[PDB]
Structure formats: C-alpha cells, structure tokens
Design a protein around this ligand. Sequence first.
Ligand SMILES: [Mg+2]
Ligand SMILES: [Mg+2]
Ligand SMILES: [Mg+2]
Lengths: 195, 204, 233, 244, 222, 231, 240, 235, 211
Amino acid sequence: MDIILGIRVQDSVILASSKAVTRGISVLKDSDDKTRQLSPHTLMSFAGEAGDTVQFAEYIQANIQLYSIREDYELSPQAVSSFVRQELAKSIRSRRPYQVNVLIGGYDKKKNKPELYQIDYLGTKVELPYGAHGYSGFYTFSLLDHHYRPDMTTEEGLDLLKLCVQELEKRMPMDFKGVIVKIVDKDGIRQVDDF
Amino acid sequence: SDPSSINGGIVVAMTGKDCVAIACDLRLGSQSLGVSNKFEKIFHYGHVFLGITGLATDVTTLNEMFRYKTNLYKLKEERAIEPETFTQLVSSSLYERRFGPYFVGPVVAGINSKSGKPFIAGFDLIGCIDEAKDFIVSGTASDQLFGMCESLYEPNLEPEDLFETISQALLNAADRDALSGWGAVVYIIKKDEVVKRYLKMRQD
Amino acid sequence: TQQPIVTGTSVISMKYDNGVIIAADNLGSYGSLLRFNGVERLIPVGDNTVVGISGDISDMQHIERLLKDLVTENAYDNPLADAEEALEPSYIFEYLATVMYQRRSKMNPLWNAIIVAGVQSNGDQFLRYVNLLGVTYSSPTLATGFGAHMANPLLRKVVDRESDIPKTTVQVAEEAIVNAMRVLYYRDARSSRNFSLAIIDKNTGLTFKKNLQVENMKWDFAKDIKGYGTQKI
Amino acid sequence: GSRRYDSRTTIFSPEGRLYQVEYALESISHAGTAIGIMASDGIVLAAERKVTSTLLEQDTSTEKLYKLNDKIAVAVAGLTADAEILINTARIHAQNYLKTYNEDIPVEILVRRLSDIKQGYTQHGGLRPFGVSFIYAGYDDRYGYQLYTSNPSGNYTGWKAISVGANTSAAQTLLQMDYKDDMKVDDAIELALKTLSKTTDSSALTYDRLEFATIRKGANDGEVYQKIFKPQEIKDILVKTGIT
Amino acid sequence: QFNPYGDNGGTILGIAGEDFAVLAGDTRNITDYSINSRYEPKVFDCGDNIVMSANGFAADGDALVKRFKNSVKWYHFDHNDKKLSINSAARNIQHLLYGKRFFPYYVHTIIAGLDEDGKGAVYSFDPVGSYEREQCRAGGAAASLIMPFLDNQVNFKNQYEPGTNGKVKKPLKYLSVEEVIKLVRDSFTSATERHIQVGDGLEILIVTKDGVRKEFYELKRD
Amino acid sequence: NNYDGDTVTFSPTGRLFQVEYALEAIKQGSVTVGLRSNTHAVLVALKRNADELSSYQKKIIKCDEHMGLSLAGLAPDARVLSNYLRQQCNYSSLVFNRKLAVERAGHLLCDKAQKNTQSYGGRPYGVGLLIIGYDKSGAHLLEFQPSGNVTELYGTAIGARSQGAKTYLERTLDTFIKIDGNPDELIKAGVEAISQSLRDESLTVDNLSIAIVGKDTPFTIYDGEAVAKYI
Amino acid sequence: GYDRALSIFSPDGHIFQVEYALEAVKRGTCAVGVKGKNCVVLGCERRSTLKLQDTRITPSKVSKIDSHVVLSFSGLNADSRILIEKARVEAQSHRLTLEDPVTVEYLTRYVAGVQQRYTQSGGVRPFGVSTLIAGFDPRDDEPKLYQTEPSGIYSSWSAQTIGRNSKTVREFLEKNYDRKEPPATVEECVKLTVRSLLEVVQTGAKNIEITVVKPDSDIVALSSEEINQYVTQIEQEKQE
Amino acid sequence: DRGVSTFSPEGRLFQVEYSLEAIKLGSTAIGIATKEGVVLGVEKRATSPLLESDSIEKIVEIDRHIGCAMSGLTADARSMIEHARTAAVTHNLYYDEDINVESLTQSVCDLALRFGELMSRPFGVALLIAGHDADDGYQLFHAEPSGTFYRYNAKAIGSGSEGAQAELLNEWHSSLTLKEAELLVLKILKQVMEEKLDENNAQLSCITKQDGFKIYDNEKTAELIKELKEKEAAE
Amino acid sequence: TMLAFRFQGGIIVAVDSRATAGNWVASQTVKKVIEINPFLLGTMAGGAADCQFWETWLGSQCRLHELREKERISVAAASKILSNLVYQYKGAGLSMGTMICGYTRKEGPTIYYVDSDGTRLKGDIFCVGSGQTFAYGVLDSNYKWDLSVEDALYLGKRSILAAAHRDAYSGGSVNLYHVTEDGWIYHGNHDVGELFWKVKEEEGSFNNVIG
Ligand SMILES: [Mg+2]
Ligand SMILES: [Mg+2]
Ligand SMILES: [Mg+2]
C-alpha cells in the first residue's frame, strides 16, 4: 500500500496509516486498516506488495499471540521487533521474499517508555523518534526534523501528525483517502475516530 | 540496486604504538534519503572489535551471528576469543556463503591479550583476509579513505595522536561521500582500557 | 534442450500393393561439412520392420540401441518370440512414439524425425511418422525434412490416396523412390549420392539394399548456360 | 529380522511406569550428590565428585557444574557424557533465543526445552533415555532467582532447595529442616556444605571431592555474576564454615 | 531453443440437436505450409456414447484423448461398469487439462453425446480446463470463419420475422440431423475455400441413443 | 514351529511356513473352477455369503477386454493383485499398442508375489487366482499360487473341496478341450465340474458366478438371472 | 527410522499399551471439572509429598490453550506438555485461517485425535495422559466441559473427575450434582468442586488448586486464602 | 515377539482376528435396509450418568446420500470417516455426481490392510455404511478391519450381534416399510442392551432419497419408543 | 464486468457473459457466477479456467467444512480458503478476480474481494474486470442502503449494461442474483441486445445512440 507514518512522543507511540486500497486505475476501498495488534501494548502497521502485507502481518500476529499464551507474558516491543526483523532477514534470501515494510509501535510496560521501530523488507531495523516508509518520509521528515521535541504530549503529537498529513495531501500526487490514526500507550491501544 | 551502496557508510581501522583504533560513521539511508543518524557499525565481542559496512540488514545479521559464535566459543574454550582467531572465524563464516554472500565489508580490530600485539584486518564480502600492518578501510568512501590514510598515517603513533589521525581520515573522507557522514564514532583501544568518542561533524 | 550436431537428412517412404518401401542416404553432416560418408540410417527390427531416422545421429544411435534392447527383452520368457509374439511394426512405433513425446515433455528431446515402415501379422502395410515433438501421422507417402517438400509431391503422383495403393506395384514404387532420391541429390545441399533402400513385402519379406547410387543424372545442359544474363561468352 | 533384538525402550509396564526411565533414575541414585539452594540475594550450587584420585587434575576438571550462559548454570547427576550432549544443546538454544529476540532466555523456557528433549526419548525413537538429572540455577528479570530440576522422564519442577543423585532422601530431610525463606547466600552456602558433609558416603568432606558455584547479584550494581569456585576457594569456604 | 509446441492445423465443429449430437472435423494434418496427411482421423469414439476431439497440437491432442479413454476404462473398473455421463466426462476432462496448468495441452477440446435426459449435448474446453455446455461450437484454425455462420444459421441471430421490422425475432425451431449435417458440410466447404489449413476430407461422428455413426465427405485438396 | 514367525525364515527341512499358511487360506476359501477349449476360456465360481441377509461375495474380477481372473482366499489381496494386472495390461496397451500375453501376465504375478516371500516386514499374499484370457496364441488358463508358482493348464480348480472338480476335469480332459465355437457347452462342462465340489448346498441364482472370454468374445461376467440358464 | 509397532492387539482384543497408559493416568494426581449455569470450575490435586517447592515457578496443573479455553490433566506430566503445545499451536492456526477462535469441542477433537494417532503409529507409545478441557465458545454463554483419554475417545460431561481416587470423587459428584439445577453461581460451583476434592485430598491447605473460567475470556485462578475460606466454611457446616 | 502381518497356521492374520475381538466388546449397532430407506441405530452406552449422552456420536454423516454407524474402538473410526468424507467429496469434484455407496465402502476398506512395520495396527472398529444411489438403490454394507465388506439386507454389530442377527433373520422381509424398520431396530436394541432403552441412551437415523441422511431428534425417537411399547402390549 | 453490493435487502450480484481471446469473442453465454452452496456465491473474472477450477474446488472445501463442523461455513472462512490457496501459487501466473458473497447469522450479508495477487478485502461495494470503471459510475451515483430488492436488482442490472455498452471486452447478457437471509435467488439471464433498447426507451438514457 502507500503511506504509513509513526511518531514516538513522551508517553505514547502514534501510528498513522492511509485508508486507500488502489488496484490499478480504481480506488477499491477507502477505509482499509493497514495494521495488526501483535499484543495488548504492541501495534504493527505495514505497507508493500499486495497480499504479502496482510499475509505477513497475520503470520507475525499469530506467532506473538502463541508466545503470549505459552509464557503467559507479553514480549517487549524490542523483542517483538527483533523477531520481526529476523523473519524479514530470513525472507529476503528466500525463493519468493516478503515484499513488506513495517512500523512497530509499542509501549514497554517494564521500562515505562514508548518505542517506535522502523523495519524494511530487507530486514533493516532502526529505532526512531519518528519514522516512515516509501515516499512519505520525503515530505514528512523535514517537518518532523523541525517541529518535533521529545517531551511532546499525545495531543501535540497528533497536531504535528495533522501537519504531516496536510503536507502529504498538498504535495503527493496519489489520493490516499486520509489516514487511520492509532495511539499506543500504558493503557494499551486505541483508535482516534475523528481525524 | 548495488547492495553495497544502498545504505551507505564507512569504517576505518589503524594501528598505533601498543594500541589500535577503529572508527565509523553513523549514517543509514535508503539511497538519497537519510533515515538514521545513530546506526553504529562497530561492535565488540570481549576485547575484539568488529566494524561492518555494506548492506545494513547483513551488518545487523552478522553482528548477531558473531555474538552467537563468540559466546559459544567462550563457554567451550573458557576464554575470550583473540583477534587472530576471530579473523579466521569471520573468513570461514563468510566463505560458507560463497555463492550467496553477505554484502558487507568487515573490519577486525583488537589487541592480543597474551602477546599484547596490535592487530587489524579487513575482508571482502566473501572472506579474503587483508591483514595490513598500517590501516584498513571499508565502505562507500573507501577510495577517499585510502587517500587520507595513505597520506596522513605514520607508524607508531601514540593513542591520543592516533585518535586525531583516524578522526581526520574518516571525517574528510565522509565529507566527499554523499552516502556517508551524519555523525561518527571513534574507538581508541589499549590492552586494558577502551575509550569511545563521538565526533562533531557536518550533518549534510 | 540441445542443438543437433551430426545430422542425417531426408528419409522417404511409400506404400505399395503388397508392402512398403523406405529409403535414406548414407550421409552424416556436421553443419555444412559433409563429414561422414558411410552412415546407415535405415535400421531393421526383425524381418518385418524398418525404422528410418533423420536428424541428430548421436540420438539415432541411442534409438538404435533401444530397438536392439527391445528385441532382446521381447525374447525373454517368450517361446513365441519368432512367431505369434514377435515384434510388430505397430508395437515398435508406439514404443518410440511414447519415448519421443516423453522426452519432449521433459524439455530434453531426441532431435529426430522417424518413419517406421513395416508389414503387420495380417499382411497390412504399416507406415507412420514421429518426430522430436512426439507428433505422429500416417499417410500413403511419408517423408522427412527436404523429402517432405520434394519427394512427397512426386510420390503422391503415384499414390494420391488410399485407393491407389492396390494399383501400385513394387517396381513402380521403387522406381518412384529412386527418382525422388535423385531429385533430392540435385536440390538438397546436405544429401549424398550413396543411399540405402529397404522393401518390406508381405510375400517376399524384408529386402535390404545397400550401396545404391544415384544414376542417370542430367547435367549436359550446363554447358550451354553462360553468365547470369547478358554475358555471351 | 531385527525385531528379535529390540529392547523396546519406550513402553509402559503393566503398572503404567516407563521401565527405562525408572532404571535411569536408579542409575542416577548412585551418582555423586548435587545440591541447589535458592536465597533472596542469590543461588548456591554444591556437588560431590565421585571417589576421586590424588592423581586427578582437579583445577582443569569439570564433571558436575556447567555454564549454560552468563545467567544460567547446571549441576549434573548421572552419566557425564550424556549430560554434555544435552548441555551443548541447551547452550545453542539460549543463543538462538538471544539472536531471535535480542534478550537473554528466561530460565524456565530453557529448562522446558531440555525437558522436552528428554521426554521425546521416552515416547519415540526406540533409543535409551539420557541417564541424567539436572539442577538448573539461573536468573532473569521476570521471576528473579530460580531453581529447577529435570530428570530422564522429562518432568521438571521448581524448588527453593533441592538435591539430586545419591542420598536425596536424607539430604532433602536435612534441607527441609534448616531452610528458611528469609535466608541469604552466605547462610545457604553453609547449609549446602553441611548437608553434603552429613549425607556423603566418604569418610570426610574435602576440597578435592567438591565442585561449588554461586549465582549472585553480588555483582557491581543491577546485574548477575556466576562464580565457579576454584579448588583453593572451595578449600577456604570449607574452613570458613568450619567443616575442615 | 527447443519449442515443445507445434501447430497441426485442422478445424472441428460440434452441434447439439434435440435428441442427437454431431462432432465433425477435417482430416488434414499439416505443419507450416506442408501437408503431413490428407486422412488423419481427429474425432474419436471414446466409449459410453461419447465422442471427443482435441484440436491444435496433435501430440498433446492424441495424449489427452488417450488419457481420457483410459479414464473411461478405469471408471468402469472402479464403479461397477457404471456409464460415464457426458457431464461427468466433461468435469473429468477439466481435471486432466488443469492438471497441466503450468505446461498446458495446447488444444481446443470438444466432446459430444447425450445428457442423462437423452437430449443432445456439446461441451467446449479451453487449453487449461475451463469448460461450458453449449448448443454450438467450432474449434481450431477456421473457428473464426465458422462460428458467426452458426450464430446466424443455428441460433437465428440478427434474424427477425418479415413485416414486423425488427420487433419480432425469428423463432428458435429445432433442427433435424439431416439439417445439421447440411450446415456442417457448408461450414467446412466455406472454411476450406478461405483457410489453407482446412481441406482434404471431412469426417463426422453422429451420436444418438442407438450409438455412434460415421460419415465421410471429400473436401478440396489444394 | 520356531520357523513360522516370519516369511524370511526357512525351516530345517527347507520349508517356508508363512507361505504354507498363506496357501492354507486358499483351502478355506470357496471353490472356483477354470477350464478352456481352443476357442474359449471359462471361469466358474461358487460365491459365499455371510448369512441369509448378506450378499454373496464376488469372486471374479475383469482385468482387460481379453483377460480376467477368479479368486479364492483373502479378497483384498485379490483386489491388489488384480489392480496390478489391470495396470500391466494397460501399460502394454498404452506404450506398445499391444494386448498383454496371458503367459507374460502370469510371469508378472509370479515375480510380484515372490518379493513378498523373501523380504522382512511384509507377508505373502493370502489368495489363489485362476486367470483366463484370449491373446495372439489363442485361449489360456493359468493357476496362481501366492508362493509365486504360476502354471498354465487346460483346466483346474482351487478352494475348499476343489479336488472333486479337479478329478472330473482330469477325466473330461479329452472332451471339453474339443468344445470349439460353442460357449454354452463349455460353460456347462464348467458348471458340471464345480458341482463335483458341492456338499449340502446346491447352485442357486445368486450363488453361481460365471465368466467367459474367447475369439470374438470380450471378458464378460454373468451373475443373477443371467446364470439361471445354466442351473 | 524406528518403525516398531508398540501398540498392537492381543488375543482377547485389547491394546495393552493403551490400557497401561490408563494406569499411568490412575497414578496421576486427581483432577476434577464441574460446570455451573454460567461458569466452569477446574479443581486439581497437588500431592503434599513435595514441600520446599517453589509454587511461583512450578508448572501449574491448569493450562490456558487460548484466552477462552483451559486444559487440565492427570497422568505423565512430560507427556501433557506435548499435547498442550500442539493444542496451543492449533488454536492460533484456527484463528489465522477461520478468523474465529476454536470451539471447546473442536479443540478437544484435535487433542483427542493426536492421542489416537499415537495408538496406531509405528515407533511411538500412547500418551499416558487424560485431559479435562473446559471453556466457552466464542460469543456463547453456555458452559463446556470435555474429557479425553489415551485411546483417543472424548465426550462431554456435566461434571467429571480423572486421576487417582477419581472413583471416589465421581461417586460424590454423581449423588451431589443435579442436572435440572446446576450450581447457579460461581460460589456454589467452586464450593461443590472443593467439597468433591476434600473427599480425597487429605489437607485443604496447598493441596487444592481451583481455576474459574467464565464467558468472554474471563479466566482467573483462586489463591490459597480464597480456597482456604471454602475449606473452612465446608467443615464448619459438616460439624452438625 | 512376532510380525504384525503374520499368518496363523490356519491361514488367518493374527492382528485382524484380534481386532475382531475388540469389536465384539463394542456397543451394539444395527442397520436395516428397505425399499423406502435404510435405518441405522446404535446403543450409546454412557459409562456414567454425568456424561452428557448427546455428545456420544456413534452415528455419522459421510455425505448427503451416505450415513455410517460404528461399533468397537470408536476413536479409530475418525480417520476412516475423514477418508470417507474426502473420498465422497473428491469424487463429486472430479465427476460432478454422487459417488456409489459400494465405491465409497471399497475406498474405506482399502485402508484396512495398510498396516505393517502405513499405520502400526488394523482398525479396532467395524462400520455399518448405509446409503442410496441411482444405480443400486438403498444399500447397507458391513466394513470390517480385514478389508472385506459384505452387503446386507439387515446387520447387527457389537456385543449383542449374534443375538440381534438371529432376531433380524426372522423379522426382515423385502416389503418392510421405513416405520416398521425403525421400530424393529428399537425392538432389537432394547432386547440386547444392558440398561433400559430410552431416547437418551439409544439413537436412530435413516437415509432416504428425498431428504438424505438424517439423525433423529430425541423427541422423535421418544415417540417411536412409546409407539413400540404400546404395540408390544397389544398382544 | 461484475459487481456486488450490500444493502437493506441483502446483497445484489450482477455479472456480464462475454469471454474473449484477443479481439475474438469466444463466448457470449459464460456463467461468471458460481453457486458454491445455497448461501454462497462466487464471481469469476480474469482467467476462465483458474476461476472455474478453484471456485468449484472451494465448494468442495466448504462442503467438507460443514461435514466436519456440523455448521455452515462463514463467508470470511470460505473467502480465506481461496485467498490462502492462490497465495501459495503466487508468482506462478494464476489470473483471478473474485467476489465471495454470502449471508450468515453471525456476519449478516458479507462480500469479500479475493485476488490472485493474494489480496483479500471485505467491503460494501465491489466492481471487478475490464469494465469495472463503467459500472462504478452508475453504482456510486445511485447507491443507497435503503434500496428495495426491486430497485437494487435494477441498479446492478443497469450498471452492467453501462459497462457492456462502453467496454469492448464486456457484454453478451446479464446474470442477476439476490442474496438474502434465506439464501440466494437467481433473477434471470438478460440479453444486452434486447435490454439496451428496452432501457433506452423506458429510462430515456443513451441519447447519444440512435434507435
Ligand atoms: Mg545531505
Ligand atoms: Mg483449403
Ligand atoms: Mg462492449
């Protein structure tokens, strides 16, 4: 798919993901949620080749849910991100690689810290204060490099995210039909229904 | 397209008097786009240091792999691996992927704990060992580093002088490369103390 | 997938009233080089079948061995190997046809065009074609390569349809085959003057003729041809 | 055919017991006693080497206490060769977990994995089980200090204090008598050595007949240190506790 | 490079009547601009009152027919000599074709016979197994020449009733076997005139409750 | 005794007891008769029922248009072997455009049964077969034993009380061999032969099973009211 | 590979290896399952021969297969882990492909199928384990309780017990459990489950484990003190 | 010990003969075939009153036109049913039609002797496979672990089989109605069962051409039981 | 051209009938709707064989599900069996565009778009094929949740007609299906050659064409 953004503020991680699903010359759906809850305090957004994206996300989801049940324990975001990276790093030298880029936003309940990980289809992991995949970063990183401060409040993070989406809506050629925004904090995961 | 120059980055190592130095930039990018300015390329397993340039997924993967192997080595041997031995391990590990290689340019640096002799070594992506006395270079600005090192370097430099030489070799080489820079780290290594210094450089 | 190296050109054949005739020159070409001048491309199987093969010679030699092995295998635990349970032309063909199509389906063909000529137990004439693609067909006249283009037209003037077969004698049929072989020598750049001819008759059996030559050739008129248009001398 | 000579190692008795497991446990009951004691500020591992010689090179010798990673160690009771097969597997499993999740393996997960391997040999394959019982001493940031034991059946359990090998019945009674929950490592060290000193089949307990180890947060600030005791260090702690 | 496929030309035609069915096909076999055979049967009786033809690449066509005939034999063995219905045969052929989805039988297959209510039936297949019951279907080289003629003369397409001027269609009256055979012969005569791969001879297999009958007709040999 | 635990063990007198026990399963099976002339070959089989509510177990299996057999012993083993024959008959047709010779069919069965008698883990087949067929050398009748032994015969019988039918055929040898171009009389001789193996029970309409193959006669099985003619 | 047929029939038509696997279950600690009107309770015996145990880390007897289903067992402990693992994997696989969590019946059918497979596969012995599988189907408020055994047969139970002295506690449940009116509340259901174990257990201290499963993935394990209050109230009513 | 595929001196496979003994210990199952349909009935035999009897599934649907009842080690039947269902559906996929009851039964029986040293032992369960097809009409088969299957007009398997079979011998005739067959299964089940027959410890089912295979409700069977009691008291 | 949309009265499914090989019209009588069971429908677009084969196969898997689970298969589960299958063949060259449409108690009326690329999407409206854009125009401007079964059926019929007219690779005839709480209901084959002139006259549309 197209645009997926992430921003880590003081006490939460905010993921924004486009709603459009274009298959050729037609916009098939304008309400697609490009994300899966891996665990109560870990969310993964994704974008790449059709089919592979969802197949990969649900495969990762299942594995983490299996781990949670076996150990009666939630893995740290760092641990989940490392598991995901290894799967993609394994995948890139396969017969047919997963063509999927992901952002993993999680709140570590042990350290009481939000964490944002950006991983591409090659298995290239980086922890960031804010991240993006595809052409999104080309427009948004300049704004983020400018207005972001690490002690921001979730509301300030959302305002800065609106600034990013407005710039994308102005300068990007493709109509991505707005974004679904989700916040990950100590209380878990919730969706901002008005954006 | 060329895997060795998608992410970009550089590493350089030098020998001094009873000391070695290894340095790297902090950039990680997706071609023209700068993504991270905290992607370190130097790792260590005990007192042996390993710098890795090239494709970032493989840099991360190999680090995890050599951590794996050096941890088992230590449990069985009941001692930390030495630079000379680790160098052979890196070569072996890389050549086993001869026809499906990791796209990297590793650089080993360290001091033998028994002999006290400084040691550096470089490799190609498939295991060929370049065991130089003076210096080793790797990355997208290796040509630049070769020119800087070949002119700036002199043998038997003291730790604090060696720092200046390797720092200026890296900095000025990175500034002539589009895919390198965005910060830099320098490790100064002595037989039983290691100092790590982050360098102030231009962020473009 | 390969490419043919040492090759054999046309194999021509036709039915007549009491049997079938088949013929093929004794050349093994190596591109434009006429390298081997003593190659037998008609291979008899028993006393009732002759298999004529064109195309790659190394593959021909392989097929030759399969047929030799087929006879051996048919004799095993077979008291009627020289009688009721002897190899028929139809059995030999279908075997080859199976092999050819299997090999093309593995994308590793036997680079040949084969004509199996023979006479069945009930005296019926057998004449069927198979090639590297596993393509099969039967006709009163069959020819491979250049023979398809030049021989068939001449042989079809003798036997144009099924009803012409009982009207065609062995002398007339052999005459047509020998004439066709001459024509191919005139016009095929990969033919030789020397050839082998085989007759399988339901009465007189298998007659295998070796060391035949193209004769009664017309060349004298060449002396009168001068230049390419305007030249008189 | 070959059926004639098959012992059938993986079958139930009429009573519902696994013959080979029961006999492997009988084998282990003759092995040198190993004791594990868990305290609030660390874990103690103590073990007795079997009838040694004066010509045995003790300082380079290891038959009882093994290191799985920096956080986890094991005490062995049974066939040493069998134990080393499993130990190398466990070491690899810990490294696999570290590579996958970039975190040190939780103690129980490692213990479960080895215990599952042992279980497999009792249910399928037709091979004899590993004649080994482990005491796992380890630490992680979830449960803190943990003691486990596994045996040839592949069954594992958690403990505050536990013994394996010879004279476990006598040893377990002595531990049950003197163990308390608010106990500390230095006290646990003393309890372990006192228990061995009473249950030993030898005439006297000496440094050359012992292997000793501690897992302490007695490492500079929030981290854990493993200490495999040297022969001279075992000799000193024997004098300190007043056994020699 | 080796090309495992070829084109043996030919053309086939199936027409379903009210209580009969026909499957016709020319007897010419070719490669490029040469004739291989003027009489090489292409339409086969496969048993159980089913007729079949796999037009296109003859090697794949002969292989498929051979394998289907085999399937009929084993259907009798495995299911107590039960008669294989035309609908069941069609589905079986879909699986034969799709079994080679990634290395196809390069053929246009048609089968004809009677359904379980005794009515005429024709089924048409593409090279990779898609199939559909039809009243009328031409296949092969000259299919593009014949089908429009059949749309017009069998289904009365674009034909209306005089006097009404486009308001009332021509009613779809049923055709007799003698009427169908006329349309088949005219179809192949016309195809022979304008298509070089069509000619030599026409062989028609007619299927009724009484069994399978054959009819042969000469075609132009040029 | 000590040498009957598996098929891989000779006894001290050189006997294979597992094979002999498999042979015993045939003797427990219901009687079936085979006989031929120069033009036709006939199978006659006495089918056995479990009780009055049950059907009568089928005894005859078709292998090709020109070949088939009757069974006595373990029916599932006959299904395995008949399936193998079907495949071999079919391989001969598809590859060589050649109907499989009855003698060669016997050789293939012999070799398939043999492998089960020399290897560990497996077991011998627990069934006897009577194969009839018409090929290029005329009519044929074979007797298959799961020891591997296959024998071409003019006539024979296998199963319980088969000795009575076998003696009858041994007397009638000169008569029934001459029954050429008359299928009904050849079947009559077979029905009369199998009657010599009956005790207490007699041939009823759902009891009797007959098969025939010949010069211009495909292998066809007759059951039910189709065999009432011969009762 | 090792292909030896260990589970085979005997002259009297018994598979002794499967029957000896049941004897291993008979040896195992007692487990009990009781379903109320809007809940299911799983009770489990802990033999007090093992003190100095660390109850934080010791494998608990009741295992969550998913957030809405639980599994307890009697028999070989090591064998039970293999079934539990397979069941947990199948639970996630079912969610992945069907987009809906397993029904309690489906999960039971799977575990039972695994147990059966080990009774006619070469080179393997049967599981020496019987299980009690309990929970609530997705978007359903009807309680579910199933039992499995080494042979692979499974069935649904209003109340059931397995393990050592299960004959005694089944005797108790058969006279005390009324089908027309099952334990209406969580209290009544837990009380009846504790009562049934008290017929066999010995001391009501740390020897009884109780786990209550309610609809919509509401699973909780009772503590020592909470259970001890039931033990106290039961005997005080008994003194009369 | 001895081979799993060993022949006895009498010419029987030891393991097959021993599995037949296990089937004799199983709960009774009865099948009766008529021209109006085939009826299948089973004894549930719950080991305890706390066992919810409706969870006992000894009668099973293979396809819309084929049902199946079991007796013996019922856990062994699950893979046989799975194969039967797959075979039935697969044939419909390949041939766009229903599969013949005999062909279905033959496919199940092919599994039977696939044991050795494939599965480690024969099946310890017998099946009554009942169904309908256009060619041979209403049919009832008895599939054994020997690989042998007999067709039956009526058949009883399990612990009360020889007593029930003798009763079916007298009672069955070619003009039985479906209602008469239902009562007849109930009558014979009640005779051979240890416990008193009711709608909770016994289950009925039938297969008809129109409605296909149906397992009877406990309310529907209860009425047939009451109808049976009255007609037996009628003389 | 094929469409499917959710509304008050369940689901409407409408498809065309044309099949082409290049510019050659191979068939005008193709059945692009697959009756998987009394409650499930499957639409076919792309490769004729791929769609036919794997959707009839899907019906075998759905039948096996309800035999094993004694319960009707969900539209979600049915669609995912097909999507997981085609995903295994990804790269091999399958060509499929399908809508899996059905009704269950737990889900209500549901439509899933399944694709040979592995795409599986739930939604209210879908149009697939070479003439999908033409159908979308009519649908989007006239769609409401509160449509009568009669009006919804017409909208679907009219949206295919729109595409049959403009798209060269669409046409022949229109097949209508209506899926309710009690299953699907076929609503006839409608020849475009007669439907066009009928709609033009009655609706007053298609004023560019002369008739
Ligand atoms: Mg820059
Ligand atoms: Mg022409
Ligand atoms: Mg158009």
